[PDB]
Each structure stands twice: as structure tokens, then as C-alpha cells.
Nucleic acid binder design. Sequence first.
RNA 1: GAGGCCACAAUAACUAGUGGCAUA
DNA 2: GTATGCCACTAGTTATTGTGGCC
Lengths: 404, 545
Amino acid sequence: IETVPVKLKPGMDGPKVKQWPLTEEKIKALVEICTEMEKEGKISKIGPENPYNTPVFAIKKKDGTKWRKLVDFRELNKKTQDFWEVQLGIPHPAGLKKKKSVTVLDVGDAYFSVPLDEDFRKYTAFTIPSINNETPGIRYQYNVLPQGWKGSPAIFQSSMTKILEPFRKQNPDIVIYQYMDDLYVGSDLEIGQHRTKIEELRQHLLRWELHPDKWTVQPIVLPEKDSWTVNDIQKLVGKLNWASQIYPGIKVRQLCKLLRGTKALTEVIPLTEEAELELAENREILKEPVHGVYYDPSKDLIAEIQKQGQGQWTYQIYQEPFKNLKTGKYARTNDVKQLTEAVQKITTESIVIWGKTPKFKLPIQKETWETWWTEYWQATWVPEWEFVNTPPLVKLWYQLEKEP
Amino acid sequence: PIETVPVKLKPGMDGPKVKQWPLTEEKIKALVEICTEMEKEGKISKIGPENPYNTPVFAIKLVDFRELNKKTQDFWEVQLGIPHPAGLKKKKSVTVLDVGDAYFSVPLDEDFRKYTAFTIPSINNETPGIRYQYNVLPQGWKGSPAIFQSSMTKILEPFRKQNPDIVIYQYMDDLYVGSDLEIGQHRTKIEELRQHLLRWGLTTPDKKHQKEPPFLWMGYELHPDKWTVQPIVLPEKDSWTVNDIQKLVGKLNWASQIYPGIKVRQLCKLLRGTKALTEVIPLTEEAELELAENREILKEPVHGVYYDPSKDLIAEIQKQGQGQWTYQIYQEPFKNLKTGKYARMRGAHTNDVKQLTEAVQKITTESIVIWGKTPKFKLPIQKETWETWWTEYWQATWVPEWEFVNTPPLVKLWYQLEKEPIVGAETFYVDGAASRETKLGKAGYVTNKGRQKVVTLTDTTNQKTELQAIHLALQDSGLEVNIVTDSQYALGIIQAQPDQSESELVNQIIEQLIKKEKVYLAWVPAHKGIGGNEQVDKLVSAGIR
RNA sequence: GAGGCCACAAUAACUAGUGGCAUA
DNA sequence: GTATGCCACTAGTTATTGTGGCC
Ligand SMILES: O=C1Nc2ccc(Cl)cc2[C@@](C#CC2CC2)(C(F)(F)F)O1
Ligand SMILES: [Ca+2]
Ligand SMILES: [Ca+2]
């Protein structure tokens, strides 16, 4: 079968991304995988006149602990975004977020047998590095649609629906959504009947879980105290004052009114009636779904994460600062372990609800993250990410979120 | 025969049309002889009017391809990083073969040849000159190293497959060949390699002409079983220029890979700011001391050993003070594979546990580059000091494999702030203010016991006054104190207990906090009518706003 | 035809984002 | 009223100089 032509935008150059250094055990694992992929025609060795490059990694498989190859096409995906979103975009069903159970299925090997436009193959170049720069570096390029390129599901889309039209008529209230190399299968059935309803699909493809409505935003719960000190009120005011950037009806005027004069931090302050009322109004604003926050499809999603201690992490998903479309907590290892699981959890939620992955703001140094993230990565996509500090008030605020 | 590599010009570009300047009759005579011979061997060919390109003959690389190079496509670049010697493995027998006719042995892509045209001018320059183009990779052309290396890799692959146990490293025009064979069997393998290469026209020195170890390579001296750096001479001068000092820091940084404990921070300070290269710079006595120690380090001979892949790597770090750390990597005690240093060049208030964790991250990355695996660390810090710092810190990290080693100076937290306000201790509300225009500022406190103080400062900032204010509260309080500030800057510096930094104010503050026995420190937002904060704010902003 | 090329380091410059302060 | 500066944290970039090399 012939290939769909693909082109970068006229000013665009191909990806020239530097390969991060790999451990010897991952280099050896990648040499095996690639010589097997070459023996099957899926990749070919390339010469030095190809200047492009994309990073390659080794991650462990979901099922087995055998090694798996991850090519980080984030840069190529950005450079081909007209192709895989406008020209051949895949629509996202708003019903998927409402199923009781959603299953994730790996349909990655489907692309292995569709050829890639010859004029585009040079842009898929990657390099298996060597220890200590002792040998030049083994260069390949793709002959078939690559896993991890967002062009692959778009190109394979008309083939994909033809495979699924039978299963969709038979089961007409099951939603199938595909994002990159994954199938998201949503059903309101119960668990035992759901797991059989996917095996019928797992056989239909072979011939050729998530609980979204359990995802629930928790309210902020303020301290309840029988006796308030100056210190307690000062701490509460700093948090509520900051939080008014989220909830504009929050007020601290009556609480600040109680802190008259140069008081000792442990002095007890009885709450006047005006104070108790401001506080009670504040509690009500907080245990009510925030308003004026609505998803904008023309904007990037952003996920921020705070380290809370004792293996606890809070996160927010937003597009404009303080306008959180979603917030939550992730509970338990090491920091990088937990942080990589949080990122994959949040990205999966974000794929189901909006069909996009968010750009992550991570509270870790870049170089530590780049050294260790593949030690626990199991996904086939890689979200964009950057590295930030955490302001103390941010952490202190989302620490108040009610535990589920 | 060696097959050509297709090479293109950059999109939208034509080839060079650079005019050739006239030359002396002596230069033309020598060029004619050189080119007549190159033409006989088939490396260049005479061309005529059909070719519109030109590149100047090199004026003291026969030809200067700077323009062609700008117009040539990019390549996957060859030998980006060099091996580090500590990543090599010990070998019984080692050989280096320099390939004599390397570029001359590789044909140039036929449709690219026309862009390499050049002219030998006539002596009168009233008659046209002799024009040529290259048939092989030209010396100096951007593409030749990457194409030659790629050709050499395909040539070497059959030989490597039949000789799994022989290491061949290709470096420019040289092959380094290592084996564990006794020298007699090694030399038999060397000659087979020479024969393999000669079938493609690649010539190499015979046994009588091959160099014997040690090999000089990239400033290293490589032995079969060890490596060192070639000698390191530090000039002895009474007066130092900026350029002299730059030369020192480069030699000292080069030495620090094998000479342990090198330090440069005090010499680096002397290079800050404007400075013409000739300006003589007076050496600080701290510089003079550190230069002194470095001279004593470099008096003793040292060497590195090679990597035994069957043993664990071990990295050990020592604090050298003032933000400087030093490390050694070995697999057997007292036999370093390499050493290095780590310095936080920005004069920040980094915590010592945090500086140490960056040293570890630097060493971990370097160790994956050189050996393909991470070492086990021995760190001058107890497991509980490390645990309390990181579980109290907003940032994630992870050091997978380390252990305490009791070699001082140990890393330890100097004080711990309270998490709850102290009963019966005086509450200080502190504040500062400054004008940007005049650099005039004030710092002070007011107290629940009725006390208060304001001090006026010159050549100061909003940031320093907030620290000054905390200085004052600490200075005039008892051994237990609650302090309330609106500067998250000043609070973060204190919570992130700095090492001895450059700011004398911060060191003074850290000293005061050691001597205290209970300090609770709290933040409140400014301009909210919070009592205490409001009174002191009125005090320090009087002659300022 | 005033030299380029690689790694590393230092310096200078442009820094940008987040955060409390602070200007207006 | 959106812009500025001061410095902690986070992330860079193009230039110079130096060390060790290569043309
Ligand atoms: O792995 C090893 N071990 C080793 C030990 C001593 C010597 Cl002198 C040389 C080597 C070698 C190399 C090389 C170039 C980077 C100089 C060799 F290629 F084998 F020669 O690499
Ligand atoms: Ca202040
Ligand atoms: Ca003030």
C-alpha cells in the first residue's frame, strides 16, 4: 500500500535533539531490539549525511520486565503539528469521561506494517550511543510508521475505524477512543462483564482499569479550633489572602481586625461574631465547586505538582494560573519513583477528559530528572515538562485539601 | 572499491565563487609541482570553462574551504566527545596505526566535485591560471571527517566480527588497537589488520615503524595498564596579569581530573569584572594560599588506572569549604580511575546538604558517560542529617546508593527552627525599607514586651534591610525568641540554612542562630493591618516613603 | 584570505519564569 | 496601574578567554 505524503512547515527544520547518555545495560538492550527491527525491515541503518536526530531510551514493558524501546518524538511531533491535528486529527468523545470503567489497551504493533513516506524518513533518525564515546554511534531511521509519532495514529486512522466498526455495532454503548498507541475502552457495565467485553475486542484485533467517574475534586477544609492563638490566625490569614487569587469571595478583613497591636504569638484571641461569620462564609466558599473555570480548546493544559512529604503529592491541572480545571492528591519508593507515577496518572486522566497531555511543571532539578525518569516510565508517550520551584504558600494551601 | 556518500549544499545555496589573489612566482612553482603530482595520482583533475566555481588556494590544507564549508549541508557530527582514559580497559598489548592516505583513499560524490574547484594563478596574472577540482575528500572540507569515519567503520566491520576480542578505536586518521594477546600473537593480528586495510588502499606503518607505548593522545599519556596527563608546569611570577591567571585556571582545571584536591575558586574571583588582558592584578592572600597548596599537590607524580568492568565503582566526596567539593573514583582502594572537583560558581546561599547533592548529581552523570553505570557513594554526611533535610525541603531528589564515611569536615545542619511558637518568649515583629534612588534604608523591630529599635543604613536594598531587621531581633533577644517578618526572601534564606557564604550579614545571622536555643520564625503578608507588623512598618518607613 | 573545529572551565552579556517584599 | 527592582529558587542563550586537541 502507498504512503500518505508528509511535510514539515516550509520554514521548519528537522529535529536535532541531543541524545542523553544511557547506561550500558540499556545500550545493550537497545542494540538487540534494533538489530531485530532492522532484520524485519522496520528500520534501516543510515549514513553521516543525515543530520537529524531524536533521543532513544529503554524502558521496561508493562507486562514483562524485558526491555522496550522508547523514541522521544516530542520535537518531531511539534514540527509536524499541522499534519496530525488539523489535516488528519482524531476527534475526542466527551462521553468517555463518564463511563464507570475505562480500560487502556496497547495497539502499538499496528503501525509496524504501514510504510512511511520515503521523503519523511530522514526526520525519524535516531542514534544508539556508546559508552565513553568509544564507537561512533549506531544510526537508524524508520521505514514504517513509528510508535510515538503522532502522525502514526492519524495515518492509520481510516484503517483503525474499519477494524472497529464491527465491534461498535455489536456493542453500541461502548466508547473506544485512541490516543497515540493506546485504546481507551469505556463501559458502564460491571467489572466481570467489562473484562469479558474487552477480551472480545482483544480477539477481534488479534485476528487482524480506570474509573473516571470516581475522579472527584475535593474541597479545601480549614482548621477548626476551639481556641485560636495569634499565630493560628496569622497563618490562616496568609493562606486565605493568597487563596483569594483562586476564590475572589474569600476575605480576611475581619480576621485581620482581630490582630490589633503588638501581640505575643501564643496569646489567645476569642473570635468575635464578625470574625466567626467571615470564617463561616469562607468555609462555604471553599466547599463549593469553583465557578468561571471552563476548558479552552485553543490553550495548552498545564499540570503543577507539589511535594507534600511522607510520600504525598498534590497536583493541579489548569490553563490559566489559579483557574484550576482539576486538583487532586497522589498517595504512595523514592521521590522520582512517586513523581513518575504521578505524572503518568495525571497524563492518563488528562487524555481521557480532554484528549490532550498537559505540560508538566515539576519540583525537581532537570539533571536529576533526566538521569532517572526512564527507570520507572511505562508509558509510550512523553509529556512536555519543565522544572520549577514551589512557593511555600502553594504547598501550604493544597495541603488543606480534604482526604478522599 | 569505497562507495561515495551523497552530499548536498544547504537549501537555496550555490557553490563558492571566491576570487583567487595573485601569488609570488615561488608559490606558483611549488603549487604547480604539488598539483601536477596530485593530478597524476587521480586525486584532482584539470577543469575548464564549464565550471563557474572557485575557492582560494590556502595562504600560509592546500585550499581554504571556509566558504564551501558554510554552504555545505550539516552532517551527523563524528567524535562529538572524546573517550576519557579512565573509561578504557586494561590491555596487554596496544598498537596505534596512523592511516597515511586516508582522505586520498575516499572518493568524493561525483556531483559534488564541481564545487571544490580552485585555481593556480599565472605569474604574470595576464594569462588564465590552471584550474582543478577534487576527486577525493579534500583536507579542510567540512564533510571529510564524517565521511572518512563512516567509510572506515564499514571497512572495519568484517575484521571486528572475526576478531571479537580485539578492541579497535578510530580517532581521526589513527586506529588504536588493543588486545590481551601476548605480544607475538598481537603483532600477528596487527599485520592481518594492515592487510585488511590495504585491500581498500589504506596504508599504515609496518612493525618497524609502529610507535611503542606510552602513546600521547589528547594531552594524556596512555600506557597498557595506566594513564596520566603529560607534565603540568605552573609559572612562578611576582606579578600576574589577567591573562596569566586565566592560563592558571585552565591548567589547574585540566589537572583536577587526576590530581586530587585541586581548588580554583580563589583564583577565579580575581577574574570577575572588567579587565584588559594586560592589567596586572594583585593576588589576594587567599589566592596566594590556594595557589600554594596547588603547587604542592602537583609536585607528586600521579596516575590513573583503567576500568575493571567486573568491580563496582566507588565515588568518595570531601568538602573543601567555601562551596568547594572534591571527589575520587576508584574500584580498589588508593587506585583512582579519576578525580574531579565541583564548585557552585554563583555565590548563592546554598545549603551544604544541597551542595553535596549536586556534586553527587554531577558525578552520577559523568559516571554514566564514562563507565555506563552509576557508582556507590561514600559521603561525609550521616543518614539522619540527610533524611531530615530532604523530607523538610520542597524539592525532590534521589541518590540511589550511598553510605556514611566519617572523614571530616562532616556535613551537618547547624540549627533547627521550631515548628510552633514558643510560650513565654518575646515576640519580635521585624521590618525593613529602602529607597532605590538614594540607597538609604532602615531596619527595626517592635516587641510585645514594649521594646523597639530602628537603625539607619546606607548603600542598602529592600532585601538587606529585611535581613538587618532579623539581625537586630536576634542580637537584642534572649535565648528564646519568636520572630515575625513579611519577607519570604529572608525566611527562605534562614530555613535553607546557608553554608558560610559571601554575605557577611548572612554569616552573622547564622552565628546568632547557633547560639540561640529556641527560634520560631513566621511569615505574615504585608499591608493587611496585622498588628505588630503594622507598628514596625510605620517605624522603619518613616524617613523612607 | 581580519581563522576556524571539539570537549571542559572561567568571565562578560542578554536574561526569562515563580515567589514574597518595593516602587509607581 | 501594568510596568519596574531586589534576590532566593528554576531554566537557559551568544560572545570572550583559558586548558587539552584537531585542521
Ligand atoms: O579499551 C581500550 N583499552 C586501552 C588501554 C591502553 C591503551 Cl594505550 C589503549 C586502549 C584502547 C584505546 C584508545 C584511544 C582512546 C586512545 C585501545 F583501543 F585498546 F587501544 O582502548
Ligand atoms: Ca517588608
Ligand atoms: Ca515595609
